[PDB]
Design a protein around this ligand. Structure first.
Ligand SMILES: Nc1ccn([C@@H]2O[C@H](COP(=O)(O)O[C@@]3(C(=O)O)C[C@@H](O)[C@@H](O)[C@@H]([C@H](O)CO)O3)[C@@H](O)[C@H]2O)c(=O)n1
Ligand SMILES: Nc1ccn([C@@H]2O[C@H](COP(=O)(O)O[C@@]3(C(=O)O)C[C@@H](O)[C@@H](O)[C@@H]([C@H](O)CO)O3)[C@@H](O)[C@H]2O)c(=O)n1
Ligand SMILES: Nc1ccn([C@@H]2O[C@H](COP(=O)(O)O[C@@]3(C(=O)O)C[C@@H](O)[C@@H](O)[C@@H]([C@H](O)CO)O3)[C@@H](O)[C@H]2O)c(=O)n1
Ligand SMILES: Nc1ccn([C@@H]2O[C@H](COP(=O)(O)O[C@@]3(C(=O)O)C[C@@H](O)[C@@H](O)[C@@H]([C@H](O)CO)O3)[C@@H](O)[C@H]2O)c(=O)n1
Lengths: 198, 192, 198, 192
């Protein structure tokens, strides 16, 4: 007896997604992560290596690009592909940013072990839905999503979790760029001229 | 303090999401996806450049995950042969914040020459743009201010884009009545 | 007492790579593979789904592009990513082309199992250095590389093996395009105008 | 018969590989790689479009595998922020069959504005082209005929390009004295 129009259904989705974003835990973990990024990339001239699987990995891809776009060299390392030679992308002073909703993604656990064997000094920041997970407990810094309910009709498909992860990405980029004092001239050098209205 | 600054960021991002304009365009977009992919057995081809393109990637994956075959077609690469990915009954989902991204304009022209019946949905910050005007359905981001210190870096725009993606997937999976059984067949056993 | 200049060293590498190509086994397996591609894609209107890991995977990527460029719709499905939802790219009448030098690549074995559970009618062509492997024996068609020695100084890095793989890719494309009678007009529609001198 | 036709294709592809012109340009390219990456600790940024770009992808992986950090930078995506991947001491390896690929020409100009000291090696079928003449080192494919039925599709050209990649990797790993221990560290345990 209770028809709901598509518009109203979508407005509720907006409220749920917006609420998930408002609920992102904000602790001194952010300051610690931003300090690591500034120290390792901006000062020591390493690069930020991001990784994840599935939709979470695609957010990691987007975070690497946003950092490149804001003067923090960054590359996505596919965690399966790492095991077939791509691990050799790693250089001295690099920093890892890993995304794992579960905190126990097989390829990410495997990547951390292999990366540590190659360079035990490498640090990692983890973005996860589960701060009690192995990856979270082993991380140098753990950023939690707050573990919002997915808006998937089955409660399963990454939706609100991935929206939260992209915001955590934005936060890291914006706080870092404030510290590095990234300029509009440096922005222009990393983009085609249309970005400056030329 | 950094904590207060991040809280302000969260307010701005959440407000951008709350501000996404909701019209009958969503139902029209969902009906096209249901018709072309669910009924006619085409696939959803997504595209974009830069960070917006990476959102387009994530949307394709989300659709595959929920029973709507979907692939990302790089709009520059399309012009070097990858356009041949296109099959009868496919549907394009194009993401362009400006609504005039060079490679997306080029993609639309080449795709139209290949198959003039192909339709497209565009997600854009500028519904008055060429791409928007030519689209079969236009979904606006509401063009929120970026939270970038320079006002330039895609941040709130790409967060909105990912949410629009989520919306399309959720409303589609309602219509197609996608089941947990079919979810489980598209994922490793840990997902059950 | 026996210095070898770089030019002479490189000439030897060319001889070795060229010989690997000459040595590619040519049997009726090619006709069977081409028949499957023509049947599934050209007649039944499925698409060709390629996959591999590491450098072999990048050859799989290149084959998908070459097929698209010649009128055989094709996409690369990353075999790890398949397990996180991307398996849903698969449609009725699709055909798999898998590349595994060892013929036991973890993610490829996992992919075939998962794909078979989704659609047991799906067939696969495997390109491999080991025709006695599990993937080779399970395949509908097995195309062997001949297993050339790598030109790597350690004998390990994929070099001659991936050169052969890309050639096997070229063979499948050329023989299929003969059968489909792909035209210059159809080529033109899948490329920018510079490709036609326009 | 198909067997005879395939045998002919093998001959053509093998001959293309044998015909790769070998000059001091290889030593010059390997010295740049060893200097910029091995000595100065930069990374090798590869790029290309279309199938040639997928060869550039495979070269980056092969260098990583052999102790030369390397990453593929998509030349269109570079113009949307990804150019910021570039670090001091990096070296570019560009693949353009025509030697005038729009995105690669655009990439060189943007890269040069970012860091005028950046050098580039170009692999091309046309050593008289703009990209070729402005490169620090030009490695030519010998522009073999394609085995495509139309003479169009990159086949022999891309086979030559992958071999040129193998050459650079092998000659570089000789100079760097890369060891099995270091190989094993960049691969899963099955590789040992
Ligand atoms: N050792 C493991 C690893 C994972 N899982 C389960 O497998 C599912 C998928 O988790 P994942 O393999 O770590 O993969 C990711 C992840 O990062 O968690 C990928 C990401 O893109 C997204 O698809 C999320 C989902 O949001 C589910 O967590 O899943 C989860 O329910 C997880 O609890 C498990 O039971 N045991
Ligand atoms: N014919 C064009 C095309 C673009 N532009 C300008 O170039 C800039 C970049 O727009 P784009 O090339 O279309 O690229 C995208 C886009 O989709 O709009 C890519 C996307 O990932 C993201 O980086 C957005 C930015 O959010 C800015 O729009 O930019 C914008 O300021 C746009 O107005 C322009 O002036 N003229
Ligand atoms: N169950 C398995 C799987 C693999 N291996 C070993 O692991 C190594 C890597 O093989 P792979 O993981 O299957 O990966 C690939 C492969 O497809 O074989 C990827 C490809 O890009 C290329 O790097 C090749 C190498 O050429 C070695 O085969 O390796 C090989 O020595 C193989 O014999 C193994 O011992 N047991
Ligand atoms: N300013 C330009 C640029 C390109 N072209 C022409 O456009 C075609 C495609 O060349 P490209 O855009 O540079 O693209 C590549 C290239 O790198 O040359 C990509 C590569 O993967 C492969 O598809 C090759 C072909 O092998 C043809 O060169 O093409 C060629 O015929 C070239 O001569 C042109 O006429 N004018």
């Amino acid at each position: 007896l209770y028809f709901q129009g598509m518009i109203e259904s979508i407005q509720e989705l907006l409220q749920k997604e917006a609420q998930a974003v408002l609920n992102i835990p904000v602790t001194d973990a952010y300051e610690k992560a931003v300090e690591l990024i500034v120290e390792q990339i901006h000062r020591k001239k390493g690069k930020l290596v991001t990784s994840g699987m599935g939709k979470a990995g695609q957010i990691a891809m987007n975070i690497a690009t946003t950092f490149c776009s804001t003067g923090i060299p960054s590359v996505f390392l596919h965690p399966s592909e790492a095991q077939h030679g791509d691990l050799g992308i790693l250089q001295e002073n690099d920093l890892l940013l890993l995304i794992s909703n579960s905190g126990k993604t097989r390829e990410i656990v495997e990547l951390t072990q292999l990366a540590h064997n190659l360079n035990p000094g490498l640090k990692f920041i983890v973005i996860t839905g589960n701060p009690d997970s192995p990856l979270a407990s082993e991380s140098d810094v753990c950023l939690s999503t707050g573990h919002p309910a997915e808006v998937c009709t089955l409660g399963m498909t990454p939706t609100t979790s991935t929206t939260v992860m992209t915001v955590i990405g934005d936060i890291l980029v914006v706080q870092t760029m404030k510290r590095t004092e990234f300029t509009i001239e440096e922005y222009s050098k990393r983009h085609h001229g249309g970005y400056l209205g030329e």
